[PDB]
């Protein structure tokens, strides 16, 4: 998974 705005 990939993304920004949150520390998963």
């Amino acid at each position, epitope marked *: *998974a*990939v*993304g*920004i*705005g*949150a*520390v*998963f």
Partner: antibody
Amino acid sequence: QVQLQQSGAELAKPGASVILSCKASDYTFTRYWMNWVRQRPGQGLECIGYIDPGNGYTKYNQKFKDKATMTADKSSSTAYLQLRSLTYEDSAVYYCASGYVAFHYWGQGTTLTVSS
Amino acid sequence: DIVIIQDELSNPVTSGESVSISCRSSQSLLYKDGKTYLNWFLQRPGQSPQLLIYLMSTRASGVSDRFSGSGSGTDFTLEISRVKAEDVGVYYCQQLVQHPFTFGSGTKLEIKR
């Protein structure tokens, strides 16, 4: 546009389970994290957990730990939230949220009522 | 868990003026990558929350330029430079630096006419 389509409202009895659905269209379902949050009537927002749609890996808020189970079916591009052992306190609106930017796109509102 | 708290607006705001909505966290939201993990939402009655700002200062696609976000590692402010009637609703902050991501209780905005 990125779309999340939600299950219709359900009425369930104390002790039963229910499965809500979140269906992804117009974006690659495997790419982005999927978040599940709850909003009880008149109250604020509360994070239930989140799931990676590519491997089924999950992280839960411990308040909802044994009560909830998040699953993902890649063939149908649909995420599922199972709520077990329902109580009157679980009557709430349930949202799904995903996107490259976390909590960017929502859709949602499956009103769940537990009242016998 | 991280606890997040918001202030309230005293009375209906005047159209055209600036409005500040503030939020404080029980712990620093500055992560080791140098970004601050804080979201601002606007929720209207009967609708899902609409993301306004992420990473504490970056405006979401399509959000009016009247909205700006700023803050330190524990104190954050949402700015509405020229408030309009379309801005009424409930504003939420959220931290995303450590699970579980927690929200504040919301801050209601009403406008005078």
